[PDB]
Amino acid sequence: SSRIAGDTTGKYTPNIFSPETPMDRSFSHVPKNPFWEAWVFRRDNIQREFVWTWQTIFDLATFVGGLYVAMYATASFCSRQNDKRNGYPERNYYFSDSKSNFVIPDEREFY
Amino acid sequence: MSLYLFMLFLQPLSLSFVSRSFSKISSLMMSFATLWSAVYMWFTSNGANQTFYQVVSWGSDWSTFGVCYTSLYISLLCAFIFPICVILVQGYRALSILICIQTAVSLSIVSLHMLAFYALFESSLLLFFILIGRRKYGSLSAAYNISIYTFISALGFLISAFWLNWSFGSVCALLPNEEANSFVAFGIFILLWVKAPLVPFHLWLPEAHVYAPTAGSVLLAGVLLKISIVGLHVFFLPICASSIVKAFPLILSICLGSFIFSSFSTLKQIDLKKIVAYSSISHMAIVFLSSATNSGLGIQGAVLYCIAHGLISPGLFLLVGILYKNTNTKLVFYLRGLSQQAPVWWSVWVFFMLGNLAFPLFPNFIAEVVCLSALFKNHELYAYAFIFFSFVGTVYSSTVLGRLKGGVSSQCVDASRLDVISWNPLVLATVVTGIGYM
Amino acid sequence: ADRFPPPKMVATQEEMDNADIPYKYRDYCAHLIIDFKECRYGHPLTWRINCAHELHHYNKCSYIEFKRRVAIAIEEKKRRGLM
Amino acid sequence: TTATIEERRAFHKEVLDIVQSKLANKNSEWARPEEPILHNLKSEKEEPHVYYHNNNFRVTRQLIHFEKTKIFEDELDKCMRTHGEAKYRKCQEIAKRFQASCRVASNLERGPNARKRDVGFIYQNNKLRELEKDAKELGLNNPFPPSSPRTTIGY
Amino acid sequence: AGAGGPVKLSPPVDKPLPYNYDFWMDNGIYPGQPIYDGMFGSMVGNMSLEYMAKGWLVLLPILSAPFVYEHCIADDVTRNPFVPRQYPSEVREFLALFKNGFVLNDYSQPDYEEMKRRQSGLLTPIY
Amino acid sequence: NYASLKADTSMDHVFGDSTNKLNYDFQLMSSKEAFFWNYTLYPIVGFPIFLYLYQFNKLENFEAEIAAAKAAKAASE
Amino acid sequence: MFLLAVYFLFFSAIANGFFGRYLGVRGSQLLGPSALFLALLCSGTIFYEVCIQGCSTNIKLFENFVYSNELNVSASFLYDPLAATMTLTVVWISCAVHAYQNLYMRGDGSQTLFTSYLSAFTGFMLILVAGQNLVMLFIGWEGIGVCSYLLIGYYGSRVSAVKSANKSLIVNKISDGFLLGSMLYLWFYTGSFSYCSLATFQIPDVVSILVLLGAIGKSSQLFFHVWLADAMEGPTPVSALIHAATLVTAGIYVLCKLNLHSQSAVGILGAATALMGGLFGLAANDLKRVIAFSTCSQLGYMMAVLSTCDDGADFAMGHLVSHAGFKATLFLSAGLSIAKENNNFLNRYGSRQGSPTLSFATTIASLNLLGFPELGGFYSKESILNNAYINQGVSIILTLATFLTAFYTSKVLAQLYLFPYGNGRQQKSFDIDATTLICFGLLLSEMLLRIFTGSSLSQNMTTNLPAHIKNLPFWVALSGALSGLATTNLFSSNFMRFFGNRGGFDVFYARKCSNVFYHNAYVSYTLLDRGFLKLY
Ligand SMILES: CCCCCCCCCCCCCCCCCC(=O)O[C@@H](COC(=O)CCCCCCCCCCCCCCC)COP(=O)(O)OCC[N+](C)(C)C
């Protein structure tokens, strides 16, 4: 019911007319399950079940936007500390409103 | 340099004159010859010439090509990984598409003109639209995603290049120009934001990797993500440093958010290629942030970590492609007992997964140490944030390994002689870089 | 502290360095710990039986120093009025 | 300090003369300069020839600094391994010099966002000294520790 | 016999799978398990988290009672009946440098205040 | 083609039947509970951040108070 | 000469794990133990040269392992007195375990791969111990972590074993993340990664907390002890190595190598860990789990002693090296008992005719655990207890921990030997060859030599304490032993249930931390990138 397809000698021919099923690469293919396939389809196409609810907005804001806000605040604090550490004047960052034009330290200058 | 460019132009040229039955053999020989030409370019690149090792121009500002530290590493990496892509791909159509893509990408790395960089890099726009949207195994949605994302980001970059060419009169890197404008800085930045997958512009990469062929995935992960750092070191940092220092808190916000949310999204994956593709996105953020510090440590660490990624992620993608050939499945839940059924494949899979988790005997360790040191030079908290959330990667990698490792299976799915030949160079390069020959 | 003055330091700095005595062990007992150290490392496995005189002398001097410490504690505590 | 356009063009001409003088004789160490081109330009990018030359000079200097720091570390390790339990006293000077070399190498080209590298905790120690002086003279109570004689093996 | 022991095979899925079925780890042998034991399903010993919290509430005061007395109620003068180890001046000055040293508690010393402020050092680097 | 959906009952008598099922609903934590536990654990993760914030605020406040006392001393004198 | 031992172990690993097809099961059963025997001779030479004769050596294999700008690190080995002692102990225990695995793992399919894992496992421990700079230590640290991951999950067809390996990996990942943070701090403000220039007299608290958090991972302390109990899923030779020397001791070795710890934190954490480990070992009914909880308690003692005195680091190391021996013996004898009885539960063990050597080794190791006078464990434990009297809070908790330790140790001894036979009437047998006898002879020789040579220089130095204070630990241990022999009830059923659940540290993680982790994953993926940002 089966036969060896591969030939190391190089005399390989595919027996498409052979009564016996070749032991080709498809021999070892996984059989698969109907419900697992539908679970895969459901999980990939989870945007179909997306619904805007106040709970969904709450979750998205509190975790994603919350983490962005926390990271931005921490980065701003670190920049302020580094400016105090280095001796630089308060730097004009994009959303900080500063009446100083200091952006890039002059290498030649001693701070 | 000239030999490398000539060979890069020769590879697509040869396909027109080959017999169409000798195409695979000729393409493999051409790829190895290009690798040797890249080694020659490294030989003729003297470290005494500190700014640029080599510069060649062929009659115009657009035809100005040159190699620096970043360019030389990335070009050697692409020339190293291309032959593996060549052997993995069958058919004159596929060979033609992949050769044209590689020629365009490799010409982009050494280009010193922003407009020529744009012209060469986006020439491979339809080729991926056709490649990822191939008849039976491709998805049109992913091709649309990648094509549209690239088009919008590259058009913004092009507008910034036009403004620079109008104001300065030149857009070549070798001519020193500085600008403080934020619109032009954002125009150059948006390309980097999209090409290096950074949240929320990372959605194109997953769909592309899953529905691209194994050679296509290998090239995409290996060098097309690294094109962002060539653009950053060559075309953004020299001119747009004032804007990166002005926006550094925002840059850190976006980078660390990309790291964290990409790590969390990786946990929800059931497809092996998607797991590797999301690991790539989390890995890109450290590179982008380390370069953005504009320090000696950051640039070197970013280019090193790019080399480490371009040696580790192609191996994982290649192993997954081999397993999919053997099993016709990519779902982790279908795949069990791989340790007993495929000991040789399992050994290399575990080795590369350890590499992706940045264990000491792997290049990712050295690269990560340098990048974290640069972040620590900026601030302690910056490094601490990245170091902690690295544990999320361990969770999903360990869960995947545990799911694959054991169980009951009735199929021997182990790699053949061709497959082992395919990954041997990557394993050797990984070891050699891991012991410190970065 | 003043009432109970420090004892004379027999061991000198060059001797303590030559015996490789850590700074924690340089506590007015260092000469005796030099003796004990040299004899202990002289006898790797019989030091428990052979090296008992040196250990005894070190423990004796340490006991005296501990009594001095307790005396200092009592003097300071009575000065503060706690007793 | 103001630069008129005439002076700027004159310096441009003089830099062209410098480039012509360098071009006359071949030099294999052209990109490893031993001396910088002195200038009073607002931005070094204004004159491209000065920019690249001084950038190469800075690179050479930093490479030398890195190798020098490795040397200093080697003698510090040898001196530590030689003396034994007397290391803290006898290796104070060599550690001092090694840490000074580390700070030079790091701080000269730290970058736009990078902070100063505090090897040996010298800047913190100075800050504590200033704080203690001000608190004592003004009658305030300092919530911070007083300055330390030695905080590391050297500095 | 360690090798060759009989095993039960888990039944194949025959019903629509829940969306979060990735929380279940099944290798094909019958007793599948949650990804983290105790996240759902049977509880070891039939003990909930509330029970464990109440038990810890009972334990913590008794466990913390020895530590709270010495650390908080006691003071350096009254902690122990003796002063810290007395050293020669050259040794004592070096040993007093260590923030994690044991000679910083010598209340007999005239540098006690500075030594105590050294012990309660900086939380983070200033620079 | 597809794998068989029929189970094997050979070992049920040895190792028990598969009749008993899980009681889990395969649903996640409630949004309200998740908010509390994220906003509790994440600060615990970021313990260095609060230490740096505390010390920086202490340093700046002491510096400002020194400056104020210096102004007072340099005004009269 | 100093390099040779690491070469021998890594050669055993490569030979057995890559060419084991040619060598065979017998080929492993020779090349493993022979190579580790040669490494034992080399380690003995190292111990004599460095410890006894005070001659430290530095071997730089190559320079610029990482050379990026100022950041420069080299692959160098410094054998200082701490390193020689840990190397000798580790190689001795690993040679014993390799002798043990020849007969124990014969019924296992991949005995060659197991031997290869064991030898690389030892090699990475020696890399950690002998490193001259922080990066070599990190290399060894991660190597032992990955080797533990590949050894605990050796039985891949068991969901429990692979989940235990995942648990170990994740917890250790968090710990080394904290260590990497501390490493970066120390490089930035000291100028180097080498321990010589690493010295700082004053260090900010953040570095100390990061070091402690990294150390409490491998040296399983409280809130980080979950993995040790689950590590029982692996084969018995793995458990002996991980609990005796390689994994648990590494945190203590790091804390002793760099004295950046704070007295207040270490003492409280150690005393709490010792008490909790003893209480957990009270409830346990597997033979192997009780010994792991005892390992936790001993780690708590060692961590606590650092707070007491300046000699605390020496006392901790002495207890470390003493503990490795009798703990390794306890695991090996327990594993042989399981094989002979085909059982893991203490109830069904009982008196049965056996080998005199194994029963004696079990008795002597348990006596060392209890604190029986004039034994190697006794001295190393009284050095801690007597010197902890100054810290009143620590001393009390350690004395109650001694009581609990005595109780469960005596209970285990009575259940294994004194109790009547409890297993069924079936043919069960494990005949022991001469190789296992050589293994237990090596352990017994280590135990005997520990008495004559000692553990610390200040072991017999006087602690000026009243006699009733000094001899108190013996009375507490004796009372615990007598109560354990009678098998009396010490706690109510509620507290016994609480201790059986190990304090519910894992159930809290399950119900809150893991659910929040996967809800964050749900928000990140389903709601956002495959939700809000996905087209119809
Ligand atoms: C399917 C696979 C089957 C085959 C298995 C192969 C087995 C491989 C054997 C493992 C090799 C272990 C050797 C590790 C040392 C690395 C070798 C090395 O790097 O060569 C060094 C020379 O150094 C040596 O030769 C080391 C001697 C090796 C033998 C020492 C004892 C062996 C014990 C192993 C302990 C090594 C721990 C090192 C941790 C990093 C090059 O010298 P440099 O000229 O200075 O090169 C510059 C440095 N850098 C590479 C960073 C650019």
Ligand SMILES: CCCCCCCCCCCCCCCCCC(=O)O[C@@H](COC(=O)CCCCCCCCCCCCCCC)COP(=O)(O)OCC[N+](C)(C)C
């Ligand atoms: C430091 C200088 C010297 C370096 C020497 C390192 C020691 C040996 C290094 C050999 C290469 C390391 C990577 C080997 C491949 C990784 C995969 C592996 O180790 O094991 C494979 C297969 O193993 C192999 O075939 C090759 C292993 C040969 C020797 C491995 C030694 C242990 C690896 C060292 C850890 C690497 C360190 C990386 C971090 C520093 C899978 O094993 P399991 O998942 O447990 O399943 C096996 C089946 N069973 C269920 C029955 C257990």
Ligand SMILES: CCCCCCCCCCCCCCCCCCCC(=O)O[C@H](COC(=O)CCCCCCCCCCCCCC)COP(=O)(O)OCCN
């Ligand atoms: C619609 C979308 C948005 C809706 C939902 C948003 C809800 C989120 C709001 C809370 C977010 C967390 C709190 C951060 C913002 C606090 C308020 C901002 C103002 C601020 O900067 O104060 C600083 C907060 O401390 C800090 O520097 C940050 C401390 C908190 C960060 C650490 C806690 C989480 C740790 C997890 C890791 C994340 C960070 C990783 C680096 C301290 O004031 P100042 O002294 O700096 O002076 C600066 C003068 N205002």
Ligand SMILES: CCCCCCCCCCCCCCCCCCCC(=O)O[C@H](COC(=O)CCCCCCCCCCCCCC)COP(=O)(O)OCCN
């Ligand atoms: C002064 C002006 C004021 C502002 C006015 C704004 C007016 C709107 C401007 C929007 C311009 C953006 C253009 C992109 C449109 C989204 C793509 C179209 C959606 C779509 O259905 O395309 C399908 C697939 O596309 C896909 O699968 C791609 C998915 C979505 C692509 C992601 C967008 C790129 C990234 C967005 C931001 C990038 C950075 C921005 C700086 C193919 O449709 P079909 O071929 O079957 O035709 C059948 C017709 N139904």
Ligand SMILES: CCCCCCCCCCCCCCCCCCCC(=O)O[C@H](COC(=O)CCCCCCCCCCCCCC)COP(=O)(O)OCCN
């Ligand atoms: C909301 C968070 C910000 C999201 C960005 C996250 C991080 C991106 C940073 C990229 C780094 C370089 C980019 C330069 C600046 C880009 C955005 C910086 C933030 C920003 O919007 O600042 C604005 C200034 O920039 C501007 O005025 C121009 C903004 C960019 C324009 C957007 C599209 C431009 C496309 C142009 C194509 C190429 C054109 C070339 C001619 C307003 O801040 P402010 O200073 O006014 O302070 C007032 C506060 N009270």
Ligand SMILES: CCCCCCCCCCCCCCCCCCCC(=O)O[C@H](COC(=O)CCCCCCCCCCCCCC)COP(=O)(O)OCCN
């Ligand atoms: C020796 C040094 C210290 C060792 C560790 C000591 C830990 C002590 C913490 C526990 C003591 C205080 C507990 C808070 C008081 C709660 C008392 C009632 C508990 C309760 O009603 O709700 C519980 C909340 O979980 C909780 O109570 C979780 C609160 C725990 C705070 C986090 C501290 C780490 C705890 C790790 C070990 C402790 C394990 C037991 C907590 C169960 O919740 P539910 O599942 O029924 O909710 C329903 C699901 N919708």
